RNA sequence: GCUGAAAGCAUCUAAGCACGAAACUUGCCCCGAGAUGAGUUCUCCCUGACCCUUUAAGGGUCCUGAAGGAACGUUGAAGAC
RNA sequence: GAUGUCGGCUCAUCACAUCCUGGGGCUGAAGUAGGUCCCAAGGGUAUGGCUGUUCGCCAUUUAAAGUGGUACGCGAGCUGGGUUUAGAACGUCGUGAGACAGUUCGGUCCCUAUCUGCCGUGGGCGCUGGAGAACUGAGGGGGGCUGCUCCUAGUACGAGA
RNA sequence: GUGAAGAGGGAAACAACCCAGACCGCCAGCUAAGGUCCCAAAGUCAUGGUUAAGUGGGAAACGAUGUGGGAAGGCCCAGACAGCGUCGAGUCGGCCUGCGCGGAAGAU
């Protein structure tokens, strides 16, 4: 998990989803790209 | 439930394997049920017991009538034990030390020996200051008891001198060494609270 | 001289209130008003002219938004570090009458008369009270 | 919205009990029960169930899309049922069933035992495969997640409890 | 994580459901009804006469003195008192 | 018309930007062991040599030897080594008296606690006739650390180690 | 300009800010700033909107399919966008703008 003020799609397979009031990037392709705004 | 007994004293049991077990000897005479409390009347489930024997004249009319209702002889006090779902007893039923025949571990509650007014060294294991090296009148004294203007007070629960012991203490999970219906004896491994001759509550270990 | 109510003559009635579905704070203002006696023309600031109120079903009082989880009740024990907290839902679980009591107490005057006013509030978690002898009139809040 | 738009077909066998919001469906495999969201109507007519937003519910349309999705699941599932299949992968990773408790040996120092829920049942065709079957798509999915979570597919050899269907991303160690 | 739309797909979440730590609430120990919101249960005790007057939850006289308590004494592994 | 100042000792108390223990994501994470980020403040969190030291370096431990706030917490609680009185000397500056963000040896630390607070322990009245007991539990406090070994198993993992 | 040398009402408390300049008395009335759910005097006032964060009732660069409004673009029954040859109405990403969200750790 990357925990960052700036979260963003890093590849074509990255997806923005809001869960429990937190912006998150999930990615099917790459575990490194999983992000949490914080 | 448990039973009320008296602290006879301490001794040892030598085992066949050459182990010396320190025992406290607890005289557990018959505990006679004086009152059964129930959810209807009292709001909770318990038995009140008495044990021992009281002088005919030092039992008050209020106390004598309470024993008289039960059909029990007066003992030296009254104690309650909370019942589990399974249990039931009757008023007047005797319960003996044989209740503990299959119990492996007991909690023993007594009144600890009274130390009177104790200092912080004894009461709280405070460290003494220097015996020498210029110490002026401050060898066993407590030292600092707070900070400064913030907070400008002493906090509640501060460890200070005062009354030590002469209070209720439980010691948990003591091994039952021996049960003896004949002589009204429960032997438990190790020390229990209180002076010789003091009242003890013994219950099966909660842990 | 302007009329003053007199403590040994004030007429106090008994009422019963169902807290089921009522918004906590909007129920509490109406309780506090009537415990103080602000509804009466004989209202006197130094006299308890208000009414006795039974509150039933205190466990079923409502709150808006996310207050059921997020509203925190803080208290300090007086021992250092002794800041304790309970959420509204936890309060409902353990001590449900306290939620209404805390709300109403905060809305009553502070001092002896305010405490005397609060004694007239009888809060119950269930739908039964023990006060049939006082002949409670149903009050729609 | 567009999921809600498509009305779910009710086949023959597939009883429908509307009563406010509860939608109790009794097929021939089994029977299911769902309450529903207060922004869903359910209009059953012509061997056919329909959905839509009620007024005073902004989310309305979203709640219909979920409710339709849940109903096609219960129309399915008591007609044909649901099935899920898991595999075990590893040196001596055995599964076994004993009534409504699955016995797994997944390389622990203790045999893990998994008690299947009421209505979810299971059978093992091999020692290295498991087959769950039920009326309810959520519970069969939850049970299979619980089994998979004992020993999740690990990133180097793909060992542990995979969904037969799934793919395991391997990586070479450094 | 499951199911799951909004967004035909996907998505742990918006509806719904599961899991998850020495933190939290309990469970263990001790205090604790001045908890003035002063709670409960069991037992014990007291069943005379009369007068006065702004008559009222009023003030006396005689008779009576319970249960129990205290006091005093001998004291304690209880205690500065 | 005075708020005692470094360091130590005694006793702490809080924050969390977490040192250990606990939970977890990513790894250029095979395992073992690391790296990095997130959650978490329940408890725990060295002794010595040198120096007034705090610190630091060093020796040897530990699961770890946390970072801060609290009048750089705490002298009406202790110390008085440092430092900043009066003595004396060296280097240095000055014709000199003397002086030094130099050094050196020596050099008085008061207070019977009224109030708040805190630790204990009683007396009074209340609680609605009086009394002796046993209780219920609103509420409050205490406690909460962790090593190593063995088994599982030389098993999983690994070319082996 | 005010305080100083200025009381009163408001801003929780708050010389210097806002309203306003106390000759004395009144258990009359109207207003100012500021207010009108309860503490606490007065609207649980009316009408139409926004917010779901207790935002309101601390904090930036920057991040984001939060949600309301506006003006244009693109493609689209010569079948779009998604899932995909098929299936049938919208679909795509910028611009402007209202209100929210994360970014946001401290000591009784
Ligand atoms: K009482
Ligand atoms: K500290
Ligand atoms: K890690
Ligand atoms: K901690
Ligand atoms: K200071
Ligand atoms: K000092
Ligand atoms: K002082
Ligand atoms: K002193
Ligand atoms: K004072
Ligand atoms: K002026
Ligand atoms: K707020
Ligand atoms: Mg979550
Ligand atoms: Mg003693
Ligand atoms: Mg020492
Ligand atoms: Mg001296
Ligand atoms: Mg001395
Ligand atoms: Mg203060
Ligand atoms: Mg006030
Ligand atoms: Mg879906
Ligand atoms: Mg532990
Ligand atoms: Mg002075
Ligand atoms: Mg943190
Ligand atoms: Mg702590
Ligand atoms: Mg805490
Ligand atoms: Mg705990
Ligand atoms: Mg050192
Ligand atoms: Mg200091
Ligand atoms: Mg400090
Ligand atoms: Mg001194
Ligand atoms: Mg001091
Ligand atoms: Mg000195
Ligand atoms: Mg000199
Ligand atoms: Mg002047
Ligand atoms: Mg002024
Ligand atoms: Mg004011
Ligand atoms: Mg007016
Ligand atoms: Mg008002
Ligand atoms: Mg209105
Ligand atoms: Mg705010
Ligand atoms: Mg912002
Ligand atoms: Zn990606």
């Amino acid at each position: 998990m990357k925990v960052r003020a700036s979260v963003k799609k890093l590849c074509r397979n990255c997806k923005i989803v809001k869960r429990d009031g937190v912006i998150r990037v999930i990615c099917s392709a790459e575990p490194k790209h999983k992000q949490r705004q914080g | 439930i448990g039973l009320v007994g008296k602290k006879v004293g301490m001794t040892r049991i030598f085992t066949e394997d050459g182990v010396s077990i320190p025992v406290t000897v607890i005289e557990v005479e018959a505990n006679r049920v004086t009152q059964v409390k129930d959810l209807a009347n009292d709001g909770y489930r318990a038995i009140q017991v008495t044990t021992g024997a009281k002088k005919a004249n030092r039992v008050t009319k209020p106390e004598a009538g309470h024993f008289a209702k039960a059909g029990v002889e007066a003992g030296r006090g009254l104690w309650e034990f909370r019942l589990a779902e399974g249990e039931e007893f009757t008023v007047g039923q005797s319960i003996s030390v044989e209740l503990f025949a299959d119990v492996k571990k007991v909690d023993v509650t007594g009144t600890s020996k009274g130390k009177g007014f104790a200092g912080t060294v004894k009461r709280w294991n405070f460290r003494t200051q220097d015996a020498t090296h210029g110490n002026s009148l401050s060898h066993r004294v407590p030292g600092s008891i707070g900070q400064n203007q913030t907070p400008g007070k002493v906090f509640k629960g501060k460890k200070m001198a005062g009354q030590m012991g002469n209070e209720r203490v439980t010691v948990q999970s003591l091994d039952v060494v021996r049960v003896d219906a004949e002589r009204n004896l429960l032997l438990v491994k190790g020390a229990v609270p209180g002076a010789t001759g003091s009242d003890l509550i013994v219950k099966p270990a909660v842990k | 001289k302007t009329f003053t109510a007199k403590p040994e003559t004030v007429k106090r009635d008994w009422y019963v209130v169902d807290a089921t579905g009522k918004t906590l704070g909007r129920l509490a203002t109406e309780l506090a008003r009537r415990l103080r006696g602000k509804h009466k023309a004989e209202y006197t600031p130094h006299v308890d002219t208000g009414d006795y109120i039974i509150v039933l079903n205190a466990d079923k009082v409502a709150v808006t938004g996310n207050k059921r989880t997020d509203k925190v009740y803080y208290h300090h024990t007086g021992h250092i570090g002794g800041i304790k907290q309970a959420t509204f839902e936890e309060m409902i679980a353990r001590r449900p009458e306290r939620v209404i009591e805390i709300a109403v107490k905060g809305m009553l005057p502070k001092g002896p008369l305010g405490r005397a006013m609060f004694r007239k509030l009888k809060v119950y978690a269930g739908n039964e009270h023990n006060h049939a002898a006082q002949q409670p009139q149903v009050l729609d809040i | 919205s567009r999921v809600a738009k498509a009305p779910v077909v009710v086949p023959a066998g597939v009883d429908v009990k509307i009563n406010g919001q509860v939608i109790t469906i009794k097929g021939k495999n089994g029977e299911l029960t769902r309450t529903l969201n207060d922004a869903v109507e359910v209009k059953h007519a012509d061997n056919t169930l329909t959905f839509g937003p009620r007024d005073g519910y902004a989310d309305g349309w979203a709640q219909a899309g979920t409710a339709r999705a849940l109903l096609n699941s219960m129309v399915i599932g008591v007609t044909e049922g649901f099935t899920k299949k898991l595999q075990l992968v590893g040196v001596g990773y055995r599964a076994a069933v004993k009534g409504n408790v699955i016995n797994l040996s997944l390389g622990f120092s203790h045999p893990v035992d998994h008690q299947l829920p009421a209505g979810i049942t299971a059978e093992c065709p091999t020692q290295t495969e498991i087959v769950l079957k039920g009326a309810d798509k959520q519970v069969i999915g939850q049970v299979a997640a619980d089994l998979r979570a004992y020993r999740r597919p690990e990133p180097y050899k793909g060992k542990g409890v995979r969904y037969a269907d799934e793919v395991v991303r391997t990586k070479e160690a450094k």
Side-chain angles (χ1 to χ4, degrees):
Chain A
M1 190 69 75
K2 292 166 170 46
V3 181
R4 293 180 171 190
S6 172
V7 297
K8 44 181 56 167
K9 288 179 50 158
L10 296 179
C11 78
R12 70 193 174 178
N13 302 269
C14 283
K15 304 178 184 62
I16 307 301
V17 66
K18 188 173 188 168
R19 291 180 180 170
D20 199 13
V22 182
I23 306 306
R24 295 171 176 286
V25 187
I26 64 174
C27 187
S28 55
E30 182 61 66
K32 291 187 165 193
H33 295 175
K34 190 177 49 161
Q35 291 155 75
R36 178 172 182 278
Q37 203 169 44
Chain B
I1 65 156
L3 294 171
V4 175
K6 175 173 51 55
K7 185 169 177 179
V8 180
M10 284 196 78
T11 187
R12 79 211 296 176
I13 301 298
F14 284 117
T15 71
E16 288 194 300
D17 296 3
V19 176
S20 178
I21 309 178
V23 291
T24 301
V25 183
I26 309 176
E27 173 156 55
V28 181
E29 298 174 4
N31 284 224
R32 312 181 286 286
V33 178
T34 60
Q35 189 178 3
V36 177
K37 312 225 188 164
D38 54 71
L39 281 193
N41 183 54
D42 301 279
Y44 72 105
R45 297 195 69 249
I47 56 170
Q48 193 191 67
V49 297
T50 195
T51 196
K54 205 156 179 178
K55 283 165 156 288
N57 63 310
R58 282 221 183 239
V59 184
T60 70
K61 265 181 153 287
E63 291 182 312
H66 185 60
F67 290 125
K69 165 156 178 177
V72 301
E73 292 178 357
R76 68 184 179 255
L78 291 175
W79 304 259
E80 274 189 41
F81 292 106
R82 295 285 288 259
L83 298 169
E85 177 53 62
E87 305 180 69
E88 201 75 63
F89 304 78
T90 65
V91 165
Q93 179 180 355
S94 295
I95 302 96
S96 74
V97 73
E98 286 277 64
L99 178 84
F100 286 118
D102 299 359
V103 167
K104 309 307 173 61
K105 301 252 191 163
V106 290
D107 304 339
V108 179
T109 297
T111 308
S112 58
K113 283 177 130 181
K115 311 303 171 72
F117 199 115
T120 55
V121 170
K122 186 181 170 61
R123 194 178 171 199
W124 295 115
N125 314 318
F126 280 17
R127 306 318 193 186
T128 65
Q129 297 174 58
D130 295 353
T132 68
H133 291 296
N135 185 295
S136 299
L137 310 184
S138 300
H139 301 294
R140 301 181 70 94
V141 304
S144 181
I145 66 172
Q147 296 85 36
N148 201 314
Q149 169 162 192
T150 305
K153 68 168 179 181
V154 177
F155 296 128
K156 281 190 204 299
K158 178 72 190 80
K159 292 176 181 178
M160 298 186 138
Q163 174 59 36
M164 171 176 202
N166 199 43
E167 64 181 8
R168 187 190 177 108
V169 175
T170 306
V171 180
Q172 290 184 310
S173 307
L174 297 182
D175 298 305
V176 178
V177 176
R178 185 181 295 166
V179 190
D180 192 297
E182 315 203 304
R183 295 186 285 178
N184 305 304
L185 294 186
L186 191 75
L187 280 75
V188 307
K189 177 179 167 182
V192 309
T196 294
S198 64
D199 290 337
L200 297 177
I201 295 161
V202 187
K203 314 183 197 167
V206 72
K207 301 181 174 179
Chain C
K1 302 184 98 71
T2 286
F3 171 79
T4 175
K6 289 182 183 46
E8 50 278 305
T9 36
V10 160
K11 176 266 301 310
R12 302 184 188 168
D13 294 303
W14 277 76
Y15 293 96
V16 60
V17 177
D18 175 45
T20 312
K22 311 300 173 67
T23 298
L24 173 64
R26 299 182 182 265
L27 173 64
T29 57
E30 192 55 51
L31 294 177
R33 164 159 181 290
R34 287 168 183 287
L35 291 167
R36 192 169 188 186
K38 292 290 292 298
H39 66 303
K40 304 194 188 174
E42 292 77 9
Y43 171 65
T44 302
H46 70 276
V47 177
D48 184 12
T49 61
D51 295 317
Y52 291 85
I53 306 178
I54 304 164
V55 182
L56 298 182
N57 299 301
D59 59 353
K60 293 167 161 57
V61 71
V63 283
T64 56
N66 290 298
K67 281 179 274 187
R68 197 170 275 284
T69 45
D70 301 6
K71 186 178 176 65
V72 180
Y73 294 80
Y74 294 103
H75 71 278
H76 201 269
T77 64
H79 294 247
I80 189 60
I83 186 67
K84 305 304 192 188
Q85 63 160 75
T87 66
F88 173 100
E89 58 176 358
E90 299 171 314
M91 291 300 261
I92 291 298
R94 337 305 173 127
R95 42 179 161 288
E97 306 97 312
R98 295 293 303 134
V99 166
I100 292 183
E101 287 170 6
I102 291 161
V104 172
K105 191 166 307 204
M107 294 187 201
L108 285 174
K110 313 305 183 285
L113 189 67
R115 292 185 293 263
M117 279 162 185
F118 180 80
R119 290 169 177 110
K120 303 198 305 313
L121 184 74
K122 314 294 180 178
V123 179
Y124 287 82
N127 197 54
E128 302 299 299
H129 60 75
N130 292 300
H131 310 305
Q134 286 60 62
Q135 302 172 62
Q137 176 181 345
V138 169
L139 172 65
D140 201 355
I141 301 174
Chain D
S1 67
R2 178 148 43 193
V3 175
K5 182 170 70 175
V8 60
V9 186
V10 191
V14 194
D15 293 299
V16 179
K17 179 152 193 174
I18 295 165
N19 194 16
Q21 296 297 321
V22 65
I23 297 296
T24 310
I25 314 188
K26 193 167 185 183
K28 291 190 292 185
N29 177 276
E31 191 185 358
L32 285 169
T33 301
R34 286 207 70 94
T35 199
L36 266 180
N37 194 260
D38 303 0
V40 182
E41 276 287 359
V42 61
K43 264 164 181 177
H44 175 233
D46 312 299
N47 292 289
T48 279
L49 278 153
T50 80
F51 312 81
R54 337 167 89 177
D55 303 62
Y57 304 107
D59 56 351
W61 259 131
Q63 301 291 351
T66 181
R68 192 271 184 193
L70 296 173
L71 254 76
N72 192 56
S73 274
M74 300 162 84
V75 157
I76 302 171
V78 305
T79 50
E80 22 177 358
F82 291 103
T83 302
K84 163 136 306 186
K85 290 157 72 68
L86 296 103
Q87 300 178 6
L88 306 198
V89 175
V91 171
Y93 278 14
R94 306 166 58 250
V97 198
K98 282 303 311 298
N100 64 343
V101 296
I102 308 188
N103 310 58
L104 296 176
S105 65
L106 293 167
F108 295 116
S109 306
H110 67 89
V112 158
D113 191 59
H114 189 64
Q115 179 148 58
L116 297 167
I120 289 299
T121 177
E123 291 180 299
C124 280
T126 75
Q127 292 177 342
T128 67
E129 184 176 1
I130 317 183
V131 179
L132 311 183
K133 293 180 183 287
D136 195 350
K137 198 182 179 181
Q138 195 279 312
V139 182
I140 190 166
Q142 185 59 77
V143 171
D146 295 355
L147 291 170
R148 173 158 180 293
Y150 288 126
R151 192 77 80 183
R152 301 171 224 96
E154 63 79 56
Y156 293 112
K157 307 217 294 183
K159 284 179 59 171
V161 188
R162 69 179 63 195
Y163 299 135
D165 191 58
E166 90 179 64
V167 154
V168 189
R169 293 186 181 293
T170 30
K171 64 152 67 172
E172 296 165 296
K174 68 180 288 184

